[PDB]
Amino acid sequence: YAQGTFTSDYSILLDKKAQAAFIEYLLEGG
Amino acid sequence: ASIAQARKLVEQLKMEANIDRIKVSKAAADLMAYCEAHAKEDPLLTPVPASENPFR
Amino acid sequence: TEDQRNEEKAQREANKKIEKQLQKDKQVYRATHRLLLLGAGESGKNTIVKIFETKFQVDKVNFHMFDVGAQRDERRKWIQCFNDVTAIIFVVASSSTNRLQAALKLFDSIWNNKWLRDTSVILFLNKQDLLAEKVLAGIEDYFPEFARYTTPEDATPEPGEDPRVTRAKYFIRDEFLRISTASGDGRHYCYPHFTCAVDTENIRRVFNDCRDIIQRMHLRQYELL
Amino acid sequence: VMDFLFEKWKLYGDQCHHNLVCNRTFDKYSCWPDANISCPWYLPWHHKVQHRFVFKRCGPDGQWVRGPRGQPWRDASQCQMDGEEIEVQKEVAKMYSSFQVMYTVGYSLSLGALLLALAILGGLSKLHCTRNAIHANLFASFVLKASSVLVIDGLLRTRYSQKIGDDLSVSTWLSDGAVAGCRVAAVFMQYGIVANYCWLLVEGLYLHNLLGLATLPERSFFSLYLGIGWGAPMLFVVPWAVVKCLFENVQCWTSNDNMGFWWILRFPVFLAILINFFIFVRIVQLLVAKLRARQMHHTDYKFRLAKSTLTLIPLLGVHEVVFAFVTDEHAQGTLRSAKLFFDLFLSSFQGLLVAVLYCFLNKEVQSELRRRWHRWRLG
Amino acid sequence: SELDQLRQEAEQLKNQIRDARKACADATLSQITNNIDPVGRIQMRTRRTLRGHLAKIYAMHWGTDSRLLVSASQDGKLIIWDSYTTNKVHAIPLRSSWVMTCAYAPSGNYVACGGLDNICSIYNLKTREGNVRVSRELAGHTGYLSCCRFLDDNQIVTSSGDTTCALWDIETGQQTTTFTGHTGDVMSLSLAPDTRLFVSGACDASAKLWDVREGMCRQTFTGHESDINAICFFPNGNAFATGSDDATCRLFDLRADQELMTYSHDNIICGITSVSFSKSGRLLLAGYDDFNCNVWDALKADRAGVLAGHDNRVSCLGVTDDGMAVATGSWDSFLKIWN
Amino acid sequence: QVQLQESGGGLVQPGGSLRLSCAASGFTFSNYKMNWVRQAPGKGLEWVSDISQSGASISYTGSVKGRFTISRDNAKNTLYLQMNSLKPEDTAVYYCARCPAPFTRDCFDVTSTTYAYRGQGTQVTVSS
């Protein structure tokens, strides 16, 4: 499944980069 | 019987050779005269206004 | 204004009724095969059918065969009417003033005609029994290349006849396939059959060739052939 | 899963406040009574740092430690995420961005080719032609999926490229209204994928039915094909949307969490490919039979035409069988960076070569263009 | 020894006519019309397109009211159109699917058609039952019907592929007069404005002028190389134009008894299927096998325009009695009205 | 006026040689494919040979192939048929036939129903 699987995998990856950045905000910056 | 067709052809050719033929210049002048006398009444040469035109 | 209201209303209703019939008989027109039955002479032409129209049906498919009656032998004009038929059934008396060359020249004109370049030809080679009798008793003089022709490898043995008949009748079939292949290909095709005046199963052969013609047309439109 | 992290942090903030040298203060990360404190449980990697500790001390009465820049707490080294996991995810993030650029070109090139192909098809003699009416709807399904994929990917980049600098900034980011536009584009993306394989099936069904008849099809039946092409996808997308809205209403409806709900979208896609491969084999058998017929006496050039007339692969969309040799379940591992790149390459460029092969390389279209070219060049 | 002498005598009469025609040739029509204002490029647009025929269109004809036209298609149909509103007034079925010609009565009460059945069928359009029914079938031709033209509601002249034209009496269904003399199939005919003479173009590359009342050939016009497909009369009735398979059109004058002008171009190699003049007689429109129709300045032999909208062979072409519109049918089963 | 006049013919001994000439006028010679047809006594019209417009394509009936040769000269508007080894089976009237239309490969011209673009015919008789 070319686009259905990639969009799901790209969306999970982006979500984990959002969680990572959230902890970064908690540590420093804010 | 090819003679009957040949004889009929010769008899028919007599009538065509006995006619009176006008000059080509005279015959070609009348066609030119007719076309210039009806040029205004020709919707394809001089297009009519769209109001008086049922296809447009 | 009132008069033009009802006249336009009535005229639009009359057109609507007509278009309902025009779609109803468009379905019949598309689902019917139209055929031209053509013969260079006697050739036993009235044996495939058994004056101007004959309808038959194979496997719930309607065929519309049109024999040519009181028309003259000047075919150059009325033959353009049949450029949209499915196929032209060309009937040849294989047992032949050298009527075999006349049939070859007529097939050459039909094949190469400007408007008949999309129309396929179904070739029936009749008088198979009469051809067998003549060669056994004695086309050698009419075609000087006959005594140079070998029966093709992909030829049906046809049990019950000596190879002399098979070589002679396949030579005549290759004369028409020489014209059929030395000219336009892909747009129209030739289907030669060795018919004989004993059985009327040629109706099945016309059905099979008409199905082949339609399938090749569909594949041709999709650029698959 | 980002919603779960925020809620877990909300519980932690309430937990310390409910419970509540130097005094007791709760910072954004953790809190201490008025070091020797375990890592907070709201961290998504709390399992790996279960035994770890947070080392902040006071000693003298001066501030907390030294208040270096913005009164931070320092340490956060034993509870820090593993570098190997961060490094591999950064590499995966780079690879996906390269692929995303690769198919953005393919979809944009396909969009240009298909819109140009629709104009030529819808602007010449062959208009009622059901062959070009099936193709025109097929082209509009490629345009419908290329657009929907570009829209959802553009929305995804904007949504996750923002920055948080306020406590309430995260709260409004997770709320509805900022995602409702994304969820509509998610439903429009899934419809375009299914409706593209339902028009790939109509191409097979129409051509399979043409070649089985002995005569012309009497009537075009071009109302059932519109129902299959455009109406059949809604039979599967709508039950997917409601289940996604009821059971997996997390963020934008793009991540697949429960694969059971994912199978109600790839069932009309697996079915279309399964049927069109049977039709593909049936048509190729017909082509071989006609090529090998003694009518035109093919001599060693039968293979060239039989190989060339496999431009039926982009029409029937059967190229997906070789790439998807394994069910998507547990289909992850070393088969990356070559299988995924090629699979995205074929899907994004499939609209381009469908328009090229069936609207630009077509003999009838080229002849019509030449006739229309000479007609114009008359003053 | 009679066959040899008859041929020699015929040639003695043949070249005598050539000398008589050559003697009367003083100046060409080009010389007299050399210093006249050219028409200029003629721009015509497809105002309306009539669709509804299942197969190729072989013939069409205009009504005298210049609004209704009948068209014959080889799918077995004969449709009557309202050109102004593009509405099918009638769509009648034919017994034979191979119809090669159609005519419209000057009164507008009757319609005719014919083809490979060698029969002309007259249809009553004003039947008291409200439906159009065949009222007569004229039999007696031994070849396909090529053209037919009403003189009244009671008389009609039909050309046939048996090298013979005929005058019919519809009330009795009997062939009043037979016009023999052509060698090949007669492909077209055109009635004079007074309908006392008509011209016929055959496949022997010649045309003939017939006297309807007497029933004998008056003049024979040669000059074409191949079969003549179309023929039309000049509006004043003293000339006519013919189109042939040698990719040319020619204008013949009855009084001069000689070809006047040739309408040919080096880029045209296909034959002419249809020929018609304009209201004034200045434009000669000719349909071609190259799918487009050409407008010709009849006095200067300069192509003044092109009608190109048909996807297949242009089979029929006619101009209204008021000259307001031109209708062209073709083998793509579509009619088009041009202004 | 399309006119085709044949010149030649006569009585020759078996095995002799003869040449026929077909003078053409009234049409452009180069645009048409020319033919040769004959009519033996008691039989209908039979096609003998034809030559294309350029002269590159030539065909013969099998009864005369190897003996007769056809040639055209697009300067004098003439058509030739050189005949060699005239067996007594070649006694016939030879006509010069022209295909109905220009620039075409088709040809419908063997008809006895007074085909138009055909010559008068020269009688070629062979006897011992």
Numbering used by the authors:
A (entry chain P): 1 to 30
B (entry chain G): 7 to 62
C (entry chain A): 9 to 58, 207 to 252, 263 to 304, 308 to 394
D (entry chain R): 28 to 47, 57 to 70, 77 to 421
E (entry chain B): 2 to 340
F (entry chain N): 1 to 128
Paper lines:
Recently, retatrutide (also known as LY3437943)6–9 has shown impressive efficacy in obesity treatment through triple agonism at GLP-1R, GIPR and GCGR. Following our previously reported protocols with the NanoBiT tethering strategy, the structures of retatrutide–GLP-1R–Gs, retatrutide–GIPR–Gs and retatrutide–GCGR–Gs were determined using the single-particle cryo-EM with overall resolutions of 2.68 Å, 3.26 Å and 2.84 Å, respectively. Analyzing molecular recognition of retatrutide by GLP-1R, GIPR and GCGR highlights that the triple agonism is achieved through a combination of maintaining common interactions with conserved residues and accommodating receptor-specific residues with variable contacts primarily in the upper half of the TMD pocket.
Specifically, the extracellular half of TM7 in GCGR shifts outward by 4.56 Å and 3.02 Å (measured by the Cα of R7.35b, class B1 GPCR numbering in superscript), facilitating the outward orientation of retatrutide’s N-terminus by 2.84 Å and 2.61 Å (measured by the Cα of Y1P, P in superscript indicates peptide residue) compared to these residues at retatrutide–GLP-1R and retatrutide–GIPR structures, respectively. In GLP-1R and GCGR, ECL1 forms a short α-helix structure adjacent to the extracellular tips of TM2 in GLP-1R and TM3 in GCGR. Conversely, equivalent residues in GCGR (I1942.67b and S297ECL2) are unable to form these hydrogen bonds. To compensate, retatrutide establishes GCGR-specific interactions including stacking with F33ECD (via F22P) and Y1381.36b (via F6P), and three hydrogen bonds with Q1421.40b (via Y10P), Q293ECL2 (via D15P) and Q374ECL3 (via D9P). The Y1381.36bA mutation in GCGR greatly decreased the potency of retatrutide-induced cAMP signaling by 26.9-fold, while Y1381.36bL moderately increased it, suggesting the hydrophobic interactions at 1.36b play a crucial role. For instance, ECL1 that primarily interacts with six peptide positions (11P, 14P, 15P, 18P, 22P and 25P) maintains a robust short α-helix adjacent to TM2 for GLP-1R and TM3 for GCGR, respectively, regardless of the bound peptides.
